[PDB]
Structure 1
Amino acid sequence: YVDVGPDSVKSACIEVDIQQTFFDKTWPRPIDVSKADGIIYPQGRTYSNITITYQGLFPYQGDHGDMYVYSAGHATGTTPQKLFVANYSQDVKQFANGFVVRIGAAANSTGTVIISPSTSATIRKIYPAFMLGSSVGNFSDGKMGRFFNHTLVLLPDGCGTLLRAFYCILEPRSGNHCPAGNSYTSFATYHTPATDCSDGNYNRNASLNSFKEYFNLRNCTFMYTYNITEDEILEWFGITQTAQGVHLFSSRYVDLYGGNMFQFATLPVYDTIKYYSIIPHSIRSIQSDRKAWAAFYVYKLQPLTFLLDFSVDGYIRRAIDCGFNDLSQLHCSYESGLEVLF
């Protein structure tokens, strides 16, 4: 097992204010595969200057997915207070074939800082966090969302300049507001920009430290880190699992400006992932310097046959969900003539 640093010495957990109605929004970003939304590139091949049909894992055309948003926490002036989160931890979902994620799509536009609904700001990309595992249950106080045995956690850190991936047993700590203590509402992560995101030295452990206040990590088989540099370019992230382990996908390395998803990591996770949840994050900003953080959208993958159109340089710029309707199915027919198919 790997060392992930000592246990948190913090006596209690930061209090967490759950107010789902403040996170109920109508911000639709449905899958449009004609724009190659949510496309994992064929994993074992490359294609170029050609139109094919291909059996892969894809989201449904038009699927709205599940929207998630992170918010600045409570504050009075320069003093951050309670965290402010949605009810995501108690909403455990089926992993099935995995999923893909639209990240940062609203960045640069104007949005709300959520905690103060009428306060507006320029929207900034924020990365999502996930808890995934084999079996789930309830915390001591009866709340849902506890992952048992070894659990995969994907957690951004360093103010969005790294993604952490680790596989540990999560032992809920017993302090005040912790998942095995009094007055528990939800776990969450946080960072504090005034001390964690100073220009010179970002705190690359701030989010992990916050997580370790809610859970003690035990018998970690791995702790991986992947560097990210700062920009506001939207991205796609995907995850699947085969016998080879858990596969992480991103557009950042290979198709930063186009969105196609390519594998960048394979995690030694061989117990079947059956469940996942979204880990709420709350930013401990001062009241006067709150930001608007772009919602991300999660879409489940399904075994589907897609038409895939590859540009000359080899990237997918157009797709069709063959099974979406009869007209779409004709595009994927080698006899119809609506497309020139290989």
Structure 2
Amino acid sequence: VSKADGIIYPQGRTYSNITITYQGLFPYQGDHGDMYVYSAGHATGTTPQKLFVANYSQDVKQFANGFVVRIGAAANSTGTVIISPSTSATIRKIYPAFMLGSSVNHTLVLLPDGCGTLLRAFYCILEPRSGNHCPAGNSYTSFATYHTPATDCSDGNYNRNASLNSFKEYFNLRNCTFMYTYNITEDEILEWFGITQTAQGVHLFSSRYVDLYGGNMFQFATLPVYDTIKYYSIIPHSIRSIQSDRKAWAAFYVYKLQPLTFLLDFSVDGYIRRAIDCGFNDLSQLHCSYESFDVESGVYSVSSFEAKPSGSVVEQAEGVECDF
């Protein structure tokens, strides 16, 4: 929170050169969160073969208010490839894929495409396919969207629907309400993506569009989804790199969004360089109450810790018995 990377900025107004406490959905301070890392698929020589990925799709987490994602955190640092321990390559930033479903009907899917050139967001019913290695089909470990670096990521030809076509092969797309494509400039710099659901519409926030260096996220897209989403499942992505071309891929960290009071530091620019989360610790509560990041040395009383009930007791009187 002190770093203030991936800190939501209020859409209603901006604050310049002032410090105030703001109530908004925010990640918990010192929260590791959920870490999902994309890996290269199994390949022999120059030919890509079976996809290799963890069962991110099988894992299901509640969407709740929303979640914020850290992108390219380890990018530009040499690391062992997840698939090959012996092979070591510089980590390359990759874009995360999210599947959100109101029921487990219409399913909101955010899919990175064209090797991160564009991001595609659509609300569509998903039909499982009877073919082998597909969700309806038997003997399938998992369903994973895939792309080929040799053809899809060629500088000459970039396929906008290459991930979408692979997604269509795993899941049929039926009665999609809308299709939206937003172009994101490829970069190895750290990026933050935040998705929130509001009554007017689902809102998408990207740090790169307004404050890539600061990591502050500003809404760039609006989704007209009027159905509440209670469940989100990460989509595993497997990259069909050749054995020689296998490269480490940056892990993405997902942090849940819950309403929190955050002390915020605003520069002349008004971007949030520093922030404090009151909930994590009593010292943070003291900073929030004073509304000052730095306070003079003193002994200060703060809100008392409150005991939380671990059980519920109900007593009611029942009388009389039927007689045989």
Compute the displacement of 1:250 (Å).
1.0
Compute the displacement of 1:37 (Å).
2.6
Instruction: Map Cα deviations across residues 146-196 of structure 1 (whole Å, 9 max, x no partner).
Output: xxx000000001011110001111001111211111321211111111111
Instruction: Map Cα deviations across residues 208-229 of structure 1 (whole Å, 9 max, x no partner).
Output: 1100001110101111001012
- CA distance in structure 2 between the partners assigned to 1:81 and 1:237 by the alignment: 31
Q: Which runs of 5+ in 1 are unaligned?
A: 1-32, 137-148
Contact 1:125 1:293 in 2 (8 A): yes
Contact 1:192 1:283 in 2 (8 A): yes
Instruction: Map Cα deviations across residues 200-244 of structure 1 (whole Å, 9 max, x no partner).
Output: 121111101100001110101111001012210111110111101
- CA distance in structure 2 between the partners assigned to 1:226 and 1:169 by the alignment: 21
- CA distance in structure 2 between the partners assigned to 1:206 and 1:218 by the alignment: 18
Instruction: Map Cα deviations across residues 263-302 of structure 1 (whole Å, 9 max, x no partner).
Output: 1111011110100011000010111011111000000011
- CA distance in structure 1 between the partners assigned to 2:320 and 2:188 by the alignment: 38
SS in 1 for 2:14: coil
Compute the displacement of 1:338 (Å).
65
Compute the displacement of 1:101 (Å).
0.5
Contact 1:53 1:341 in 2 (8 A): no
Contact 2:96 2:252 in 1 (8 A): yes
Compute the displacement of 1:341 (Å).
73
Q: Among all aligned residue pairs of Structure 1 and Structure 2, give the percentage whose two residues are the same amino acid.
A: 99
Contact 2:16 2:267 in 1 (8 A): yes
Instruction: Map Cα deviations across residues 71-103 of structure 1 (whole Å, 9 max, x no partner).
Output: 110111011110000121111100111010000
Compute the displacement of 1:339 (Å).
68
Contact 1:331 1:338 in 2 (8 A): no
User: Counterpart of 1:116?
Assistant: 84
SS in 2 for 1:111: strand
1:213 to 165, 169, 185: 169
Instruction: Map Cα deviations across residues 112-131 of structure 1 (whole Å, 9 max, x no partner).
Output: 21111221100111000000
Which has the higher mean CA deviation after the structures are superposed, 125-134 or 170-179? Answer: 170-179
Contact 1:51 1:341 in 2 (8 A): no
Contact 1:105 1:234 in 2 (8 A): yes
User: Counterpart of 2:111?
Assistant: 155
Instruction: Map Cα deviations across residues 19-76 of structure 1 (whole Å, 9 max, x no partner).
Output: xxxxxxxxxxxxxx10103210112110100100111110110000000000110111
Query: Is residue 2:234 matched to residue 1:252?
Result: no
- CA distance in structure 1 between the partners assigned to 2:220 and 2:321 by the alignment: 32
Over aligned residues, Cα RMSD in angstroms?
Answer: 9.9
Structure number with larger C-alpha Rg: 2
Contact 2:5 2:214 in 1 (8 A): no
Q: Which runs of 5+ in 2 are unaligned?
A: 291-317
1:84 to 46, 52, 60: 52
Runs of 4+ in 1 over 4 A off after TM superposition: 336-342
Are residues 242 and 339 of structure 1, via their aligned partners in 2, closer, same or farther at CA, if it must alter by over 3 Å? farther
**TM-score normalised by the chain length of structure 1:** 0.83
